[PDB]
Design a binder for these strands. Structure first.
Ligand SMILES: [Cr+3]
Length: 325
DNA sequence: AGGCGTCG
DNA sequence: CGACGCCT
């Protein structure tokens, strides 16, 4: 890190713009700038120098100036000091609560995790559960806790129907020592693009894992997507395994590749990739890779038979999962 | 970038 | 339906 202090600053200012003023364009600018400055190879000494870079203009250079000269930013020390702002900000940390709900709760005097516990009547189900395991949801999952969870998923999945194929993607398939949650791609030959859909295919697995006391809560659930909570076994012991977040997704059999690409990559990697796709004249999805036609229309999906196959369409050095950060 | 599920 | 929150 050559310019950590400037980046941290722009990222902090970015969150404030998203979570408090809800100014999406500023949020984007600060994010784009931070990312551009972190790749710059020299130590920045003026805002004038920083301004030469793409994505950083006057408002960001002024801030970088003030930061270099004084070791801080007045705008930010005041943001950190404003109680409505920090409260609005902290509540956004609860899964289910975004900028709107945060600004409505604070507007009504609810600011603390404790106040929240005195006001579940204001919270929808997702938010009540997110409030319930707020602390556990903060804890990161060690890769060892992950491998255990994987066996439980794969094993139960076949017991129900051996034709079921489950793959834990996310940061696991990318080679990480710890992950925020468990992301599992699911496929079954009964679910296919040329079939009349199939909701019962995901419910079965979910109810199954629910029965072994694995899946404990449900935030959201549907035909292709499950978002809930899971937990590992303990017999007579204190500090049972913390409750974990688990996302499950049912993709069509004949589209498994676009599915692993999407549920693996990285929110950042996928963004950068779906950007290229458009450049070359294609539309990458979690389902298909249909090409861009006329002035604004994508047609029939190209056939893929590996992730490698998808990249080659937009001409790229196959990015091995562990590189997709 | 692209889209799934919830809310009212 | 739009707006929101969330997924990568
Ligand atoms: Cr994950």
């Amino acid at each position: 890190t050559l310019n950590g202090g400037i980046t941290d600053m722009l990222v902090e200012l970015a969150n404030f713009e998203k979570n408090v003023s809800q100014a999406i364009h500023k949020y984007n600018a600060y994010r784009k700038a931070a990312s551009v400055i972190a790749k710059y190879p020299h130590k920045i000494k003026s805002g004038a120098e920083a301004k030469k870079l793409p994505g950083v203009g006057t408002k960001i250079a002024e801030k970088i100036d003030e930061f270099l000269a004084t070791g801080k930013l007045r705008k930010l020390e005041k943001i950190r000091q404003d109680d409505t702002s920090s409260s609005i900000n902290f509540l956004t940390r609860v899964t289910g609560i975004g900028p709107s709900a945060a600004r409505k709760l604070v507007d009504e005097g609810i600011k603390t995790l404790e106040d929240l516990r005195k006001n579940e009547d204001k919270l929808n189900h997702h938010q009540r559960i997110g409030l319930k395991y707020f602390e556990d949801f903060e804890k990161r999952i060690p890769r060892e806790e992950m491998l255990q969870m994987q066996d439980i998923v794969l094993n139960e999945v076949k017991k129900l129907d051996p034709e079921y194929i489950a793959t834990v993607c996310g940061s696991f398939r990318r080679g990480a020592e710890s992950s925020g949650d468990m992301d599992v791609l699911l496929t079954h030959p009964n679910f296919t693009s040329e079939s009349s859909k199939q909701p019962k295919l995901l419910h079965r697995v979910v109810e199954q894992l629910q029965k072994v006391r694995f899946i404990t809560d449900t935030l959201s659930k549907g035909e292709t997507k499950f978002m809930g909570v899971c937990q590992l076994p303990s017999e007579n012991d204190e500090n049972e395994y913390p409750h974990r977040r688990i996302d499950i997704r049912l993709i069509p059999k004949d589209q498994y590749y676009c599915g692993v690409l999407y549920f693996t990559g990285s929110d950042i990697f996928n963004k950068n990739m779906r950007a290229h796709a458009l450049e070359k004249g294609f539309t990458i999805n979690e389902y298909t890779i249909r090409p861009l036609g006329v002035t604004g229309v994508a047609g029939e999906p190209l056939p893929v038979d590996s992730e490698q196959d998808i990249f080659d369409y937009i001409q790229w050095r196959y990015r091995e999962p562990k590189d997709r950060s």
